[PDB]
Structure 1
Amino acid sequence: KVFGRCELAAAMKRHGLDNYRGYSLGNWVCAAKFESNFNTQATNRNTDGSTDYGILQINSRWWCNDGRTPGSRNLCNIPCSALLSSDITASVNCAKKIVSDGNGMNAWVAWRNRCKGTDVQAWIRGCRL
């Protein structure tokens, strides 16, 4: 599923992401925009053989099992395919664990490079929330 900007914002808010660990809703929407272009089905292969999955491009080296990343962990305890569903619950739940692991949202390179230090609130402007 390809989410609309305000549609995704509302879904993230409902799942408790707004100001989760101090990150306002605009941050999460901005990261989803530049990680996946709001597409739950996005996949990307990394040089080390791991793969990133779903709307927040969660990586198989640490966080999910895709059966093809040798010597990897599965810290959200889910198959990576679960992260591609049109229901974002698994992606959200896993993201909460990632952002809690000490490095905040710097774990997402696109957030660090394209959202951090910008007016992120613009990403939820105009939305009925």
Structure 2
Amino acid sequence: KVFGRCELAAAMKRHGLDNYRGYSLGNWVCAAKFESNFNTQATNRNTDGSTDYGILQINSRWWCNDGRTPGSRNLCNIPCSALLSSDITASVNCAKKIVSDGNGMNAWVAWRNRCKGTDVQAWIRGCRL
């Protein structure tokens, strides 16, 4: 599924991401835009052989099991394929664990490089939430 921008904003809000750990909704939409272009089926292979999955590009090195990242952890206790569903619940629940691990949203490179310090509000403007 390729979400529309307001459609994704509303789904994230329903799932408790608005102001989660002090990050307003537009941060999460911005991060999703640049990580996956709002596509739940996005995958990308990293240099270390890990892979990033789903709309928030969550890494198999630490967060999910894909059976092909030797020595990896599965901190979200999920198969990585679950991160690719049209239902974003599993991605949101796992992202909540990531952003709480001390490093906030800096875990997402695209957020750090393309969202942090910008007017993220603009990612939710015009949306009925």
The TM-score with structure 1 as length reference comes to 1.00
Partners of 1:75 and 1:47 lie apart in 2 by 21
Q: Spell out, residue by residue over 1:49-93, the C-alpha distance to the aligned partner (whole angstroms, 9 max, x if none).
A: 000000000000000000000000000000000000000000000
User: Cα distance, 1:3 vs. partner?
Assistant: 0.1
- 1:19 — aligned with what? 19
1:47 Cα offset (Å): 0.3
By how many angstroms is 1:4 displaced?
Answer: 0.2
RMSD in angstroms over aligned alpha carbons?
A: 0.1
Deviation string, structure 1 residues 92-128 (Cα, Å, up to 9, x no partner)? 0000000000000000000000000000000000000
Matched with 1:41 is 41
- Structure 1's consecutive aligned runs of 4 or more residues displaced over 3 angstroms after TM superposition are none
> 1:8 Cα deviation (Å)?
0.1
**TM, length-normalised to structure 2:** 1.00
Determine helix, strand or coil for the equivalent of 1:33: helix
Aligned-pair identity in percent equals: 100
Where in structure 1 are there 5+ consecutive unaligned residues?
Answer: none
